Amino acid sequence: RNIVGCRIQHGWKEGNGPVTQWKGTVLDQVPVNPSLYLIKYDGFDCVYGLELNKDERVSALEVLPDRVALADTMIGKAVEHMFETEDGSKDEWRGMVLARAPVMNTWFYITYEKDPVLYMYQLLDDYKEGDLRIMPSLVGKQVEYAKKRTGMVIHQVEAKPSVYFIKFDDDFHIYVYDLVKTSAENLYFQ
Ligand SMILES: COc1cc2c(cc1OCCCN1CCCC1)N=C(N)C21CCC1
Numbered sequence: 032r033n034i035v036g037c038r039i040q041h042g043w044k045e046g047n048g049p050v051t052q053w054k055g056t057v058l059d060q061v062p063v064n065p066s067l068y069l070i071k072y073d074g075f076d077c078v079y080g081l082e083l084n085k086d087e088r089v090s091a092l093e094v095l096p097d098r099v100a101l102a103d104t105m106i107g108k109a110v111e112h113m114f115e116t117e118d119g120s121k122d123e124w125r126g127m128v129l130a131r132a133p134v135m136n137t138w139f140y141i142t143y144e145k146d147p148v149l150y151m152y153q154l155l156d157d158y159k160e161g162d163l164r165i166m167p168s169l170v171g172k173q174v175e176y177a178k179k180r181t182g183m184v185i186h187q188v189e190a191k192p193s194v195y196f197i198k199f200d201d202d203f204h205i206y207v208y209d210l211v212k213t214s215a216e217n218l219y220f221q
């Protein structure tokens with residue numbers, strides 16, 4: 032009877048566009064906004080937030096049949112994360128391991144300077160394969176910044192408490208900010 036770890040499928044439609052079909056795993060029901068679910072969609076690496084009870088773009092929501100059931104040292108670390116591009120050449124992004132992901136146990140939350148939204152990867156596998164180099168509260172408040180983009184602070188990172196997750200009203204990504212840095216300098220809170 033778990034929410035965390037439920038598998039779901041649904042349709043998605045924007046405006047008069049076509050309906051696309053999606054499958055994913057529910058990770059979290061956000062405590063400061065229980066309408067908001069964080070979801071990992073199969074094949075896509077970002078964590079997404081949807082208010083499933085209110086978002087008219089969601090249709091035909093179904094619960095899928097239920098699945099049949101260390102390196103905490105990496106949490107908080109600066110990392111260089113290597114990956115393959117479409118032409119087969121190697122590239123790398125620098126980022127920060129944020130936490131273990133809640134439901135998909137072997138998975139970690141991570142974000143990157145080049146794309147400071149919330150991602151999820153099986154970083155211990157990536158580490159064993161040589162693709163991860165390891166280097167050396169406002170929750171519940173409203174946020175705005177000037178483009179007025181509005182949102183809510185939904186989580187504080189235990190390992191780096193100046194780092195927060197923000198859900199903006201106009202988008203389904205989860206944004207990550209370290210409030211001492213330039214990238215956060217236009218965020219204001221209420
Ligand atoms: C609408 O979602 C996506 C749209 C796109 C996508 C991935 C999407 O979703 C990933 C998984 C979360 N969504 C699934 C339902 C809501 C969030 N990669 C793309 N190139 C596009 C950009 C426009 C076509």
Ligand SMILES: COc1cc2c(cc1OCCCN1CCCC1)N=C(N)C21CCC1
Nearest residue numbers: 076112113114115124143150152153156157
């Ligand atoms: C597509 O990127 C990655 C894919 C993968 C990855 C690391 C990747 O990238 C890290 C940094 C962010 N990327 C996000 C867009 C490009 C960079 N570790 C893996 N096991 C996989 C292989 C299939 C899942």
Ligand code: NA
Nearest residue numbers: 172173174221
């Ligand atoms: Na207010």
